[PDB]
Symmetry: D3
Subunit: 251 residues, 6 copies
Amino acid sequence: MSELVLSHVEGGVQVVRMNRPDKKNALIGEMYAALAEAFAKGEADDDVNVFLILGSQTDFSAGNDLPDFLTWEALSGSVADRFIRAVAGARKPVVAAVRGAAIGIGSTLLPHCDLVYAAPGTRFHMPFINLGIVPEAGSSQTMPALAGHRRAAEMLMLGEPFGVDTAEAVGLINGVVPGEDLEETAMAAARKLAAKPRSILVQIKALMKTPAEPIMDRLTREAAVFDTCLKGEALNEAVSAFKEKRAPDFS
Amino acid sequence: MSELVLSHVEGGVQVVRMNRPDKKNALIGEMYAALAEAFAKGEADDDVNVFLILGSQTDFSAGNDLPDFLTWEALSGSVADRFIRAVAGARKPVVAAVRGAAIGIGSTLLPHCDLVYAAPGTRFHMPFINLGIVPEAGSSQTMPALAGHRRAAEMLMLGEPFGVDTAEAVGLINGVVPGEDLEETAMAAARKLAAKPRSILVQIKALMKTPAEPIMDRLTREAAVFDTCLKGEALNEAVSAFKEKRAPDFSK
Amino acid sequence: SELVLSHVEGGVQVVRMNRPDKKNALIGEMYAALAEAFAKGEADDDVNVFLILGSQTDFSAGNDLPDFLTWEALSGSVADRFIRAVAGARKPVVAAVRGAAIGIGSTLLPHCDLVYAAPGTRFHMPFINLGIVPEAGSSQTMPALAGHRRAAEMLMLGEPFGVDTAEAVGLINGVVPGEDLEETAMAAARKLAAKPRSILVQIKALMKTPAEPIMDRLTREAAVFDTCLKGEALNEAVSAFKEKRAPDFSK
Amino acid sequence: SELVLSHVEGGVQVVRMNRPDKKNALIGEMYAALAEAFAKGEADDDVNVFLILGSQTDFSAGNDLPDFLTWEALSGSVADRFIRAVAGARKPVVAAVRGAAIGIGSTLLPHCDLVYAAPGTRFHMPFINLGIVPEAGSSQTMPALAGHRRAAEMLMLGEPFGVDTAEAVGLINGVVPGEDLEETAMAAARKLAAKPRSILVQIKALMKTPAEPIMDRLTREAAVFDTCLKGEALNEAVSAFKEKRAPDFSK
Amino acid sequence: SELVLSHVEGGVQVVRMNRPDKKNALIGEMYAALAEAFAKGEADDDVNVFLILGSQTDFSAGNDLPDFLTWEALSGSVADRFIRAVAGARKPVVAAVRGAAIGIGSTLLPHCDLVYAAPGTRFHMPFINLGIVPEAGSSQTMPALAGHRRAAEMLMLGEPFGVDTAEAVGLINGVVPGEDLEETAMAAARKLAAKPRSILVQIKALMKTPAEPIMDRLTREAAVFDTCLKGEALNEAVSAFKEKRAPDFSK
Amino acid sequence: MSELVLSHVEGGVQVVRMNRPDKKNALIGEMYAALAEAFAKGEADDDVNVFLILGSQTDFSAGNDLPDFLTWEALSGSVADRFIRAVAGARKPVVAAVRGAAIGIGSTLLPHCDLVYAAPGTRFHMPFINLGIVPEAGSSQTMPALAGHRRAAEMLMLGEPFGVDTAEAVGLINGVVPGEDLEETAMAAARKLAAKPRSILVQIKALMKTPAEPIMDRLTREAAVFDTCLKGEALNEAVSAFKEKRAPDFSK
């Protein structure tokens, strides 16, 4: 319920844009709610294969609106918690395009995305410690996993901002793209995902995101899924299309 | 002459070479079986300390042969599954030297190797998604662990090929070596492993490959093993050799 | 009592190894003094952060060989006690390394929160060449940081490596000229000491909690986060922001 | 001569080597056709930019060996003509490379303005192994780009190298999956073609002017710059900015 | 209140651009004040090093557009005077950049001796998009630093770039969190200021002497070097070393 | 006339080793002289194709002996100047293996080498400014050319030491190699150079080291040399060897 979040579907891609550009997309409760709603619609909508999350023309998100944030009674059960769970649990792929400010949740959300592109000026920051609080959105797990404990301590314990150099080096983003081409490029990546066979793609994502386990268990797990694929129409169409020297159509 | 998988032992190293060069070492059932055979033999063979896996002079492996692959009833229990489990479970060290094509299993095998060198033109690819299937050989776990989820998504979800830059950056390979020296260099690394005390080296590998656990448990685990080493001949030989100003010989 | 020096300044407990003539090769007395220093610091309310240093030329060449040939076991030994003391330290630990960082000189570093190294620091885990196995959790930490193959150079080939690798795999945060090394490490310790200790400790504990299913981690972080919303540290951060001043978290 | 294909689209002259059966190993007729294509493009007012391509599998394996053994000289040869045509081209040149880039396939690239390469690309300058010296200015361009030692691996050891090195020393802009390589290179060519030609050409000429004492270069740039202040391209840029629209530099 | 602030502390002349409301977009009066500040600092015996700063959010968004449309020429202009003042400055120049570094904000940096940037810094040389050419020697300095192809992304495609590229091509020395940026740049300025000025200046002049045949350069260095052997700076360095103290090169 | 520098020839490689390990190979006049002599001999010796420069088992060179250095009347025309010119002007290839200290001349020499390998603990330093002097050996030109002006200013103006990370990134060294394999690896690189055809290799090096010039002039220059190679025995042997499916022997 706000014009602060815009959402629409094009060619199998649900575009979800934060739209409070005057405050650098600093988030408030109504935006979290609209964002959670957009994920729930997209997750249930058969015309949607992939999500694409965008910000303004100058910023992704400056994180929570600070006055608003100081009035939170809890994080547990809050609307912010709902949004984060909606993204962390999304079965469909999620692409993000970031630029300018990516602060707090603007950064800690990115590890739940499948692909992320950033503009040259992007500034990442997780300043929880400087507000007397702890990190959210699973960043206490995802950052050390990606960057190692020491480089993640610069982010979380020193509370220091970082740039695209570090973000790409630790695997937080896939690459840096000039702002004028950023949305087009992220959209091209979304389409390329949307042209894969959804039911398989979703299984791949779910396996990737399954907690790590003893290797023999994982082999068994992958193989069980794999067996089902051998019988499927997607494989059939992929082979057929390869033979006939054409692009597959997986609808 | 031209069996599809060649195997022989030199200086503690079992060389296992895929040899279907005309099809860029695209794998069929018989190769998987021969390869699993070679691992079982090397694992049991007391003259073998280390494996070295090689391809042709131009390619490592272009993955499964497609005609053969369309014959599969299942991956579970198949001969390909057997090969993969043989490598994933190998107690002895495994060195690989890759070049040209490393596709499908040619790539997804590499995380189970202990050292890997690649030639400059190597092309890595996991195109499962473009065939309507899912990744195998534990790559759904090993790729995201090595590269992080987003780079691994380029590999697995976009199904895009990648090169030696990425492969080295995410720790899939140790380094890039000019093709004319690739085999020699991989072999030198194998020999260097083979000269270590086998019984200890195997324990180090097993620890390294033990699933991660709470840190205090791991300390306890390492220490238990470590305690047995303090009493061992390998330590004794290392110290003796140091005192007598000579290179240790751990071959006994 | 001359081989290990310890003192507290500005919330930082400095712990220095001081056997420079043998490149800080450790013996039982040092381990005991080092373990004691961590126990004191962990209990001392005036201490927020530890800073571990070596000599002016070396961090540590690892165990002294004569002493080592006296060990009955690693389990239960004084070396074990030291290692546990660091691995289990609730407060942050910063290290500054240079010259030799061998054996325990290297395998200790993954338990540190920040680590700076001089140009020409030489890292080495030569356990295999002594017929023994790696200690201090390195069989887990090195593969997690470097990946299995690059860790196999270190642990299976037993090869030394340099600052290039150490930084690339996240063993250290950066390389700093020797003449500025201690000052820089100290500045980083002070910066950590100026954070709110009770929150900082929670952040470290979350970061070091074994990875778990993502929804569980979200729940875990949120439970801690909820407690922070009611805390003095948040209150001081806000107050300080309002009054246009730097926060003092000695509260 | 269907060994070289050339055509113009949207201001871009596409020049494709087309002897896929021999991995585009070059012979005299190809060099002549290539030189002709550059001369046409350089004189053609409908052409703003060149795009040079190979087969679907290779860029060029260098000189065909049988042909090469018949050369009386490099000086004055048709190969020399081609090289000079590209080195001297006033308009921008984009290349997309893959598979083999050997001999001239590599040594040509420093004359290009933008270069994209596929993941499997193999670069090689094996002159020393044939008892000859490097050509196409590589004795100068490689040391300038890579430094003398890394260039000695290429030229004195005669070792092939990959995309890691090529990107690190600035031989190529980036690595692009083969299925998107041509599209991406073409997009870059179009982007260049949409710039104001007369300015772009000046920029390229300045960039390629031999380095000189800094004050001379300031003078040189400024003289050109002064002419631009009076030009239509500036005028269009400003007009377009005022009217809140994209500029059209076709005028 | 004035648009350029300048003052001296501990041998360092701080020169700060101060039009924060327009992101330090430059006008003629600033160029004149900046050139004035350099002339003064160059002559002033109490000054050893310059430190150039911007606002708390931006370095410089380049020329103010209204002012720029007033220029009759770049040759001889006040902008030219400023650029020459920096390019020709005999004393060392350190810069600390953040936010916008556009046009001259970027093309100035190659004339600096050290440069630190904040995480969000956005570098841009959009000359081509304005129908003009690059200035401040960038047609020479960018290709030298980045190689021709990566420089073509900056100058021919006119694309902005970030701290990843800037550090990789040697345009900056490092990235530093905004809250520590000025302090760190200052610490570097002080460290330069504590060197012996007359020597330091000679080192800078040699470094900036156009490249020449190697034997000539050896001869050149040696001639200067011979003069140093007789100098007070060497004498003070040795003396200070003997007496186990820090040298004071104010002599 | 000193045992402070050891020199000998093996398999076309002249090994030149600094041998004052007690002072980390800090250089004095007699070492400069012996080193210059070794280059002059090698340059004139037909059995020598390549130089290999080595230090002690722990250090390359800590630079000039400081007490000695404070007594120099001049650098121009000194024995140190002679050495530097000998290496800078050497027509034959030069490979170096460095470790531990590489200070002053220990660093500023390396840009005149064709290949350089370094051990993990190597510490590079050009502290001229802290001694009130300027850089030597062409470093005022070579460092900025390699590293760019700003990173070179850390080295030369701030006078700060740096490590193998930076040295490899700016192209000062080819790579890092574990100390126990350093000399072997550098030697292998020397031998690989020594197996190339000397007369051609020398021309390649001379072209590489020719000052940069307008591109058309360089094309002309290369082509003139190239024309001479088309008539040479080295090309002939390369082709012949290729046809007969054997390794070339460029010894004659």
